[PDB]
Symmetry: C3
Subunit: 117 residues, 3 copies
């Protein structure tokens, strides 16, 4: 899978990015059985103030995780995985759970290429 | 929903970002009935020249809105909403309609987490 | 379509971006018949070190292409197109194929607006 992780610049130190990448990657491997190396975490940083919730400009605490997955997993498992990402990223980023949004999009496997293969 | 809004750096002033966030958020609330606070607008700025249309390098005027929505709305309503975003963002950003692209992607509700809930 | 192309800052020169935009755009036109001008390539650059594969922090060589397409093409054609993007971007960016990830997401045509139309 590819996890696009949208954060404000300087919210995560390099240490914190590695911890957040680990939490997401371990959750994905642990819950789906997909091998570690097939999980990409791609941090997308923007300046503080580029996030609006109900039209209101936020600080730097919002984390939006957009996971791009293969189709074919149950709703139950997807929910568990989304919940695990919230819990584990919140510990990893020392950030309140309320700041974390997680959406999964799904695609047929045949239109998903990792490692040019 | 989460609206990822891809713009060139310095095309939108902070004022203009707030106006564009308001236009998108109000359209979403007005047309779907989803509460204001459940709409995130996340501005993703890049340097001028990172956008190509038919292989041709553009200036800073392109706005691409990628709205990430729950599945289950009619094609008619989605079209209305996309059209409203074009009209209202174009007023809000003082930008010609021809510069505005809007795509909606949809997901089962059970794999969509807002506010860590 | 819209091709979001996630690369590290300074990995692609402006020349290389134009070459990568051309390779993607030509592949899309050649394989689907969709007119050139309907293909957007939108480069999203981040600082080196924002990409993790299996939890491991990468250099600046990863290219992730997220193509946002209309629904309705065959799995065979989508696979061919994904493969062509890998081959052609790898020549265009002078980058090993193993660095290139390509995922296609699909949407009903009626929720896809290009050029405000």
């Amino acid at each position: 899978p590819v996890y696009m992780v949208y954060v404000s610049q300087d919210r995560l130190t390099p240490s914190a990015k590695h911890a957040v990448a680990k939490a997401i990657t371990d959750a994905h491997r642990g819950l789906t059985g997909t091998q570690h190396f097939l999980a990409q975490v791609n941090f997308q940083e923007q300046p503080a103030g580029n996030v609006f919730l109900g039209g209101v400009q936020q600080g730097g605490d919002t984390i939006f995780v957009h996971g791009l997955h293969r189709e074919g997993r149950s709703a139950d498992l997807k929910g568990q995985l989304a919940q695990r990402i919230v819990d584990d990223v919140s510990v990893a980023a020392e950030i309140d759970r309320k700041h974390i949004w997680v959406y999964f999009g799904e695609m047929p496997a045949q239109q998903m290429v990792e490692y040019g293969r």
